[PDB]
Design a protein around this ligand. Structure first.
Ligand SMILES: [Zn+2]
Ligand SMILES: [Zn+2]
Lengths: 93, 13, 64
């Protein structure tokens, strides 16, 4: 058992397009509240992003609004995931 | 990633 | 030893310290702190849970 919902100052993004850069996550996530940091770790199989990224808000309540409005929605021509950076896990484990 | 919080062959346990 | 030095701040690291929040670069094998980056201690815990096929990179290791 657990809560029906949760919030945090940081949240996860995945399934984004192959041409997405850290500037896209800012312009895509800014209307829900002010962003303060963004991160994209490097994948060594092809020297590009792993197909996911990270973003951080000025408040935890603004992250819940970014999830409530872009979760499982199209960004660059295909669906992307949006949720807190705690409950999820990569498709590689 | 490679860190000081973890460096095992896998994150499982 | 005293030859250790961070690529982004004047601080350094011990040869046996594992309680400090730090990551290793995937392209030049150099260590880094969380405070000399735009990162935060909450985002550091998820980076630790990512698979080893993905890793952090210096302010230049991401472009060159
Ligand atoms: Zn440092
Ligand atoms: Zn590096």
């Amino acid at each position: 058992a657990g809560h029906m919902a949760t919030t945090k100052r940081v949240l996860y993004v995945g399934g984004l397009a192959e041409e997405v850069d850290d500037k896209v996550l800012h312009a895509a996530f800014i209307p829900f509240g002010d962003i303060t940091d963004i991160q994209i770790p490097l994948d060594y199989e092809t020297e590009k992003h792993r197909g996911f990224a990270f973003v951080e808000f000025e408040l935890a309540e603004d992250a819940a609004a970014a999830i409530d409005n872009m979760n499982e929605s199209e960004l660059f021509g295909r669906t992307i995931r949006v949720n807190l950076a705690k409950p999820m896990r990569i498709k590689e484990g | 990633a490679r860190t000081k919080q973890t460096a095992r062959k896998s994150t499982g346990g | 030893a005293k030859g250790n030095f961070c690529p982004l701040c004047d601080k350094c690291y011990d040869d046996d310290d594992y309680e400090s929040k730090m990551m290793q670069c995937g392209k030049c094998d150099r260590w880094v702190h969380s405070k000399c980056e735009n990162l935060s201690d909450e985002m550091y815990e998820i980076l630790s849970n990512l698979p080893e096929s993905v890793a952090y990179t210096c302010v230049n290791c991401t472009e060159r």
